[PDB]
Amino acid sequence: IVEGSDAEIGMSPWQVMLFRKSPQELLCGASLISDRWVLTAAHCLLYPPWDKNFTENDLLVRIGKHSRTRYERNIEKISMLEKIYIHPRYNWRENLDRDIALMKLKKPVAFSDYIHPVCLPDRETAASLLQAGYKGRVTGWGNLKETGKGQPSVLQVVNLPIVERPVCKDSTRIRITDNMFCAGYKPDEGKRGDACEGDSGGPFVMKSPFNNRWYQMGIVSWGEGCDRDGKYGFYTHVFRLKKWIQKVIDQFG
């Protein structure tokens, strides 16, 4: 996270850390959406160009964390994965279209003050909240800058405005599709911030003023670097792929 601040305890209890078993290393962000379902970016588990093909046994999912590094006894919970599901039409060859995967824990996890699911949007929430100028929130333990801040001690948080699709498309030469949106301040806007390496797969969330709940509108997917002027962060549009999410849960739950 660039130009954010430390998250508050249990400020983001759906935050999940994907952790590689060997080496013992943060892999990506993720979110808890049920007692047995974790949501992430597909590129965190499958990207053949970088020889990335994680299977069930290679990672664990750490829930309820605050510190980036410390094992936090009686606060965090680590679960083992039963099955990965990568969107079948995820496009790693071109533009990370449909950058989304679901992970199903072996056993259900106990909700607590530090562990609690975020909501997925329905039509109306999406239709109400997904609008340029409206701000969502991004969290993760990724890098504090693209290139003496480097890596943070604890969960970082930042609030970024959604951006008009034509400004998103003009900011990059990458083909950007309807399964994606972009977010970030414009060079003019005086404020700055973004996700960065290590924040991929984490949630872009918004708080509904209608019902006071937090909804995950997005998954941190990619940007051209981090917090560059004229560049934006790209997120997988969770709503547009909700059918897939429902489909998989409804079949393997």
């Binding site: 305890i9 699911p117 929130r137 948080v157 006071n212």
Partner: peptide
């Protein structure tokens, strides 16, 4: 399930985090 989206240390205890106003003020 039915509980999603409300934070045990925030909503459920009627507390607000430091930067969540920023969000609400942007909808206006």
């Amino acid at each position: 399930e039915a509980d999603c989206g409300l934070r045990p240390l925030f909503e459920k205890k009627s507390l607000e985090d430091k930067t969540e106003r920023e969000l609400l003020e942007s909808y206006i």
